[PDB]
Design a protein around this ligand. Structure first.
Ligand SMILES: N#CCC1C=CC(=Nc2nc(Nc3cc(C4CC4)[nH]n3)c3ccccc3n2)C=C1
Ligand SMILES: N#CCC1C=CC(=Nc2nc(Nc3cc(C4CC4)[nH]n3)c3ccccc3n2)C=C1
Lengths: 286, 286
């Protein structure tokens, strides 16, 4: 494939140091030549037709070039495994930090994570990518107090389908005006706004350690989302009006009324320019 | 591929009788064993990566089972050509008939074609397929006075992307309510309604031989669609109120207000059950 190496043993290039987490396990790896650190996802594939299922993820990582999105370092197919090697963020996932410290982020910490996460998302949406699995477990801290967005395992990339859709020959007398005007679902915000709702839930998850409805039987959670008004902060006196106002723009069930990442970047809750609160957080867990 | 034969010469199975039309030419073919007739599209492919571009078309033909959609009879890859063999409709395309007779269809003929075309489209939409190139040139007459819809060269099939989208693991606390409720763009009517607008233009094309804006420089046509109110019949006294009312439900620039195929099937303009007018038309061109 475009970005996947064949016929080579990944362990002739990358040395497994340990496990980071657990369709496989994720390892801490170290380049045998350069000492550069990596997370190595090792995905067990039965056949080669399965590689097609993991290729959109790999293409997204390979195609993205943003400070707050993790980079692809290498990928290998070898002895029925797909190895994906991804840049290493030494601070760990936001949710893992909250559980180790046994406390949520403070509001000033949430603003930094929110602001940088929004930058990542805005870039994705601009490039016709929907993340589709945003949560605190997929926001990773660097040693320098910045964040990177990760895990594009179920992301959608609409660039090739937009390319195929904008393609025609001969005079299109029968073309619908919404297709003429580039107002199909691929170019419209509608489907990208699913990420904006998830940002909102991630903000509450960072404010309260666990996401809304964490106490319910898992079988009830989808029903609860459908039935209920959007969630709010449990202890709203703890939080600024700008935090709560930001949330209301994300956690809006009317998708048309819900804000885009572009609109959200102008909100005073993300008008910050220092990661000092995150540097203080990662130093405390060290 | 799933539906494409390799290593076999298509002309050891199918005999070319002549040309029907002109990325290639379309031939009239005859099965050497069974005498069954076929249209043979022979598409020149440079490499094998090009087959991927023609596979959605082939899969649609192979997967559809409807009286008013043309069936796949065979496909072959041989000596750098993709052969697609499609069931034969002995009456030709609706637009070719109008040009040979030098006249449009009558309203009773349009109702039959409309009613059967709508049945085909409704089936497609139910099965998550957008045709994307509906026009009189892709509606074919059978010897019995029925129609079949053809040419899925630029169709979209959203079944595998809906399958991939409905797929998740673990508890989805971060899932947007529109994703919970199955109100993403794949399940919503919005993008399928592009076909409904094109049905409307095809109806006018059948009423007047050529589609709206046929007299303009081709470079102006997309602009004209964007700028103008929806087209109407040029000589509206010639046509019933049910024809004109049907058109208004199709040719509606507000996509939400525009009717679905399902709604259109209940309209009195398509409440017919005899193809006698088309039998009279094809007999006249013979
Ligand atoms: N799948 C997926 C995302 C993910 C996120 C975090 C994770 N565990 C984990 N991940 C990391 N760091 C990490 C993970 C990645 C890459 C997203 C796999 N890049 N950096 C650390 C770093 C330091 C201590 C502990 C860590 N644990 C394992 C997998
Ligand atoms: N591409 C594409 C659609 C198309 C539609 C019509 C066409 N020409 C054509 N097509 C047909 N018939 C036909 C074409 C097909 C099949 C859609 C290619 N099935 N039957 C006839 C039949 C009798 C006299 C003349 C005909 N001419 C050639 C191609």
């Amino acid at each position: 494939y475009e970005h996947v190496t064949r016929d080579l043993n990944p362990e002739d290039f990358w040395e497994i140091i340990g496990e980071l987490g657990d369709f496989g396990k994720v390892y801490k790896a170290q380049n045998k030549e350069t000492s550069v650190l990596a997370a190595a996802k090792v995905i067990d594939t039965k056949s080669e037709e399965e590689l097609e299922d993991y290729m959109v993820e790999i293409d997204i990582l390979a195609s993205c070039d943003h400070p707050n999105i993790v980079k692809l370092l290498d990928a290998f197919y070898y002895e029925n495994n797909l190895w994906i090697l991804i840049e290493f963020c030494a601070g760990g996932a936001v949710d893992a930090v909250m559980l180790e410290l046994e406390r949520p982020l403070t509001e000033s910490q949430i603003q930094v994570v929110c602001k940088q996460t929004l930058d990542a998302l805005n870039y994705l949406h601009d490039n016709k990518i929907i993340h589709r699995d945003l949560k605190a477990g997929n926001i990773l801290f660097t040693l320098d107090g910045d964040i990177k967005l990760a895990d594009f395992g179920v992301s959608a990339k609409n660039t090739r389908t937009i390319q195929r859709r904008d393609s025609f020959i001969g005079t299109p007398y029968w073309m619908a005006p919404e297709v003429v005007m580039c107002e199909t679902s691929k170019d419209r915000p509608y489907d990208y706004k699913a990420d904006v709702w998830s940002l909102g839930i991630t903000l509450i998850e960072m404010a309260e350690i666990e996401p809304p409805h964490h106490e319910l039987n898992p079988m009830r959670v989808l029903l609860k989302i459908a039935k209920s008004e959007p969630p709010t902060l449990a202890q709203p006196s703890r939080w600024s009006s700008n935090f709560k106002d930001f949330l209301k723009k994300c956690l809006e069930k009317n998708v048309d009324a819900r804000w885009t990442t572009s609109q959200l970047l102008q909100h005073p809750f993300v008008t910050v320019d220092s990661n000092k609160p995150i540097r203080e957080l990662i130093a405390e867990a060290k």
